Amino acid sequence: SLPDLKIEKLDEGVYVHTSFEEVNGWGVVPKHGLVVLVNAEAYLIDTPFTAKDTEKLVTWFVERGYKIKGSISSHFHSDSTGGIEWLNSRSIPTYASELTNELLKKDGKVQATNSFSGVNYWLVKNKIEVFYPGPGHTPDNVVVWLPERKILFGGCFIKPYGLGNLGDANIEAWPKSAKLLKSKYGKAKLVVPSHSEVGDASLLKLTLEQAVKGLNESK
Ligand SMILES: CC1(C)S[C@H]2CS[C@H](CS)N2[C@@H]1C(=O)O
Ligand SMILES: [Zn+2]
Ligand SMILES: [Zn+2]
C-alpha cells in the first residue's frame, strides 16, 4: 500500500520527515516537514498527514531522548495540520497563525492551542522564525527560517515546476509574495519544499517564475 513514514538527517539538529497520502485526483502525494532540535528539545515543523504518522514521528524522537516542545503549522491544509488533534490530546503545544486557526475553524477542523499574528514571529528566539510573505498557495501560508543553519522550510508555497491545486490559491498576489520571499531569504543555503526535493535558493526564483507564468495564463 502507501509508503512508510520517512525520517532523514538534513543538517546538524535538522531532520526531514516525509509522509504519504492518497489524494483523490492526484495519486500518492509526498509531504516534507521538519523536526528541529534545540538542545534536548524537538520542534515539529508541520505535522504529517495523519495522527498515526504524527505519533510515529514523535515516538521516534522521544525514544531517542528528545522532548517534543511543540509544533508549528505552515498553513491550514491537512498535510500541515493533520496531526494537531493528536498532539493536543497529548498536551504537546500546537502553533498556527491567527488566519490558519481561523481557516481551520471555518472548515470544522481542530485548531492549534497557540496562535500568533503579524509578519514575523519567533517560535524560538534566534533559532526558529516564522515569516508571512503574503497569499500564494493559500491565504495563510507561512515559511519557517533557521538562521543558524541558513535553512528555509518553504512549505507548499514553494512550487518550482507548477503551482499544483489552485483551489484555495491567490493567483494575483502570489508573484508579489514570492518576490518578497526571494528578497528576504535569497541567501538561504537550503530550501525545503513540501512536495518536491530539497534545493538551494534557486527554488525561490523558480517559484516566482512559476507564479508569474501562472498569473499571465490566468488572463
Ligand atoms: C498538487 C497536489 C498533488 S494536490 C494537493 C493536495 S495536498 C498537496 C498540496 S497541500 N497537493 C499537491 C501538491 O501541491 O503538490
Ligand atoms: Zn496546501
Ligand atoms: Zn501541501
Burial (0-12, 13-18, 19+ Cβ within 10 Å), 77: buried
Task: Say whether 159 is catalytic.
Answer: yes
CATH code for the domain in which residue 103 is found: 3.60.15.10
**Could you give the angle at the alpha carbon of 193 between the alpha carbons of 212 and 57, nearest 5°?**
155
Q: Which domain, by its residues, includes 76? A: 1-219
Q: Where are the beta strands (DSSP E) in 92-179?
A: 94-97, 114-116, 120-124, 128-131, 143-146, 151-155
Task: Give the whole-angstrom CA distance, residue 115 versus residue 110.
Answer: 13
Q: For residue 79, indicate whether it is catalytic.
A: yes
Q: Which residue has the cell 485548531?
A: 111
Cell numbers at 36, concatenated: 528541529
Experimental method: X-ray
The number of distinct structural domains making up the chain is 1
Residue nearest to atom 14 of ligand 1 (CA): 164
Rounded distance between C-alpha atoms, residue 73 and residue 92, angstroms? 13
* Residue 113 half-sphere exposure toward CB, CA atoms < 13 A: 14
Residue 195 in contact with ligand 1 by CB distance below 6 A? yes
Rounded CA gap, 142 and 73, in Å? Answer: 8
**Mutation probe of ligand 1 site: the residue of 26, 74, 192, 196 with most atoms within 8 A of C-beta:** 26
> Alpha helices of the chain — where are they, by DSSP H?
51-62, 78-81, 84-89, 98-106, 174-185, 202-218
